[PDB]
Amino acid sequence: MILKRAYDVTPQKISTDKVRGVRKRVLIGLKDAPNFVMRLFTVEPGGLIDRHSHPWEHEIFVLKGKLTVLKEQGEETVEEGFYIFVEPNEIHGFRNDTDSEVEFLCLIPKEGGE
Amino acid sequence: GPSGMILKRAYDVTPQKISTDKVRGVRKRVLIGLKDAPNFVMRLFTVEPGGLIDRHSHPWEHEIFVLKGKLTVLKEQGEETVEEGFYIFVEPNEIHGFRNDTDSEVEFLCLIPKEGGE
Ligand SMILES: [Zn+2]
Ligand SMILES: [Zn+2]
């Protein structure tokens, strides 16, 4: 059994053509998990995960801040204490329009990798 | 399967009492349940002060994230308390349980493969 403070997992900085101002922690990855993986994302002020889709779902819980969720058309802001279920193949992305860091838990089935 | 995305305040789900031979002082909210989940389910558990999930095991894993409070985790050998911001991975068949030794509610997210129910 693994018990660990999430913050202590080293975050990975992401800065690409589609993702900027984002850090990813893999809390429960493919080494350990037989079916699905647990990640924790931190979105800096102004950070962006641009619209994309994939053949697997997301299950998300917003831990801190106000997260802007991009939809195929339009967007919706939600707060700490919201959960989000993104169906497979649905277009989605994320932005942080606030002045402080936003954090969310994100789980995907193993085929999504970590 | 269906398209779209659900975005919902977890507290809009009513916390339902869990009461079994091996659980007392616990409530649960099913957030992403069997009716919708392709692969795994998301629950939010509330452990009342003094609540207890006795040591047990089952043929599926748990993935847990502690949202609020100090959670005492029961292991096959001894126990360890963790707090908000900790995650826990419980392997299939590993003995585990939980206690809330504090005077306030403890909350944690708990995800299992959907073959284990909701
Ligand atoms: Zn995605
Ligand atoms: Zn269990």
Side-chain angles (χ1 to χ4, degrees), chain B residues 27-55:
Chain B
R27 303 188 94 87
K28 177 185 76 173
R29 295 171 173 97
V30 176
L31 306 187
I32 305 169
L34 296 172
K35 69 180 187 178
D36 296 325
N39 293 295
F40 59 90
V41 296
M42 182 187 280
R43 303 92 63 75
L44 193 163
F45 281 90
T46 303
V47 190
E48 308 296 355
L52 175 59
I53 296 165
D54 296 346
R55 285 182 175 84

Side-chain angles (χ1 to χ4, degrees), chain A residues 1 36 57 59 81 83 90, chain B residues 4 8 10 39-40 63 87 94:
Chain A
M1 176 188 308
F36 59 90
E57 69 277 16
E59 305 196 6
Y83 71 94
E90 190 64 21
Chain B
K8 186 174 185 165
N39 293 295
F40 59 90
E63 305 194 10
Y87 68 94
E94 185 167 29

